[PDB]
Amino acid sequence: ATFEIVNRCSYTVWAAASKGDAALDAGGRQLNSGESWTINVEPGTNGGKIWARTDCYFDDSGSGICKTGDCGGLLRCKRFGRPPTTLAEFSLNQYGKDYIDISNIKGFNVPMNFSPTTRGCRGVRCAADIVGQCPAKLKAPGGGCNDACTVFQTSEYCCTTGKCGPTEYSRFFKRLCPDAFSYVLDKPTTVTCPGSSNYRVTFCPT
C-alpha cells in the first residue's frame, strides 16, 4: 500500500514511519513546507505509525536530535518517537479490512489529517490548536503538548491495569479533537476501510 505524506505546514517537519521494531520504507525524511513523500507499507502490517518531528538538527550522517518525536537521534527512524507526537496509526489487511486512526495518547505536536485516497471509507482529522491551548502541566517547553501518562506516570493515565477512565487531561484532547483517541479505553474512533486501501497523511491540513 502506498501512503503519501504531505507537509502543508508553513514550517519544515521531519516525517517518520515505523512499526516499532523496524522502519517503514526509508523511516524518515525532511519535508519542507509543501513537500510530499511517497512510501510503501507492506501488506498485513500491524501497528504502523506515521508522525511528524519538529525542530530537528542532523549531521551529515543523519544523526542528531529533534525537539519533538525524536527516534533515537536518527533521521531515518526505525523505532517509535519520543512524545509528544500526534500519531497516524494503522493496521492493514487484517481479515479483509484496514483500520486507521489518529491518536493523542502519546500527546500532540503537529495537526494531522489521515484520509484514504481510494474509495470506501472516510478520513479522520485532529487539527485544532492543541499546542496553544495545552494544559500548563502538559506543555513540553521542548515543544508540543505531552500526554498525562508521559508526565505523571500513574496507573490511571497509563492504563496499566487495563482498566482506566477518562481524565481531566484526556478530556482536553478529546474536546478539541473528538475524532482522535484521547486515552487507552476511549470509545474507538478507528475507521474501517477496505482492505488494501491507499492513504494520505497531511500535516497542517487546514
Side-chain angles (χ1 to χ4, degrees):
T2 61
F3 286 68
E4 189 180 55
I5 302 167
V6 180
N7 182 21
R8 189 174 293 155
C9 307
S10 65
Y11 46 88
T12 299
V13 303
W14 289 257
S18 176
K19 58 180 195 73
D21 64 353
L24 301 177
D25 198 282
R29 189 173 286 187
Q30 183 174 311
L31 296 177
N32 299 322
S33 177
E35 284 190 339
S36 303
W37 178 30
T38 308
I39 66 169
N40 301 293
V41 176
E42 189 181 41
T45 291
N46 277 261
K49 304 185 193 303
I50 289 161
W51 67 104
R53 301 170 289 171
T54 63
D55 194 17
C56 305
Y57 303 85
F58 292 109
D59 70 18
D60 293 351
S61 80
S63 298
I65 193 162
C66 298
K67 283 298 187 309
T68 67
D70 188 74
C71 63
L74 301 180
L75 171 61
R76 288 179 87 274
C77 294
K78 53 184 43 250
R79 307 286 180 268
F80 295 142
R82 187 169 196 269
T85 51
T86 320
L87 295 169
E89 304 186 309
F90 48 89
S91 296
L92 308 179
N93 316 284
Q94 301 294 312
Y95 307 95
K97 297 300 186 206
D98 292 355
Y99 297 96
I100 67 170
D101 72 69
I102 293 171
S103 176
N104 289 136
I105 292 166
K106 300 300 193 175
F108 177 103
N109 63 339
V110 175
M112 180 182 278
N113 179 279
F114 183 11
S115 289
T117 61
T118 54
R119 82 154 22 63
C121 54
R122 70 181 193 80
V124 288
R125 183 178 296 196
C126 177
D129 184 17
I130 281 173
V131 180
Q133 299 303 333
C134 185
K137 293 183 175 161
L138 299 184
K139 290 173 171 160
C145 189
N146 292 309
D147 62 294
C149 172
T150 291
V151 175
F152 293 100
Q153 295 280 276
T154 72
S155 64
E156 192 64 16
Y157 299 130
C158 302
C159 217
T160 308
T161 69
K163 290 295 176 110
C164 59
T167 68
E168 268 202 359
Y169 297 123
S170 71
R171 287 191 186 84
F172 162 74
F173 292 99
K174 195 65 167 186
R175 168 181 71 80
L176 269 282
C177 285
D179 202 35
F181 279 83
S182 66
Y183 75 107
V184 171
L185 296 177
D186 203 354
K187 180 182 174 195
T189 48
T190 311
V191 172
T192 303
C193 286
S196 298
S197 296
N198 301 308
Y199 301 93
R200 181 176 285 120
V201 175
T202 306
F203 303 121
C204 303
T206 315

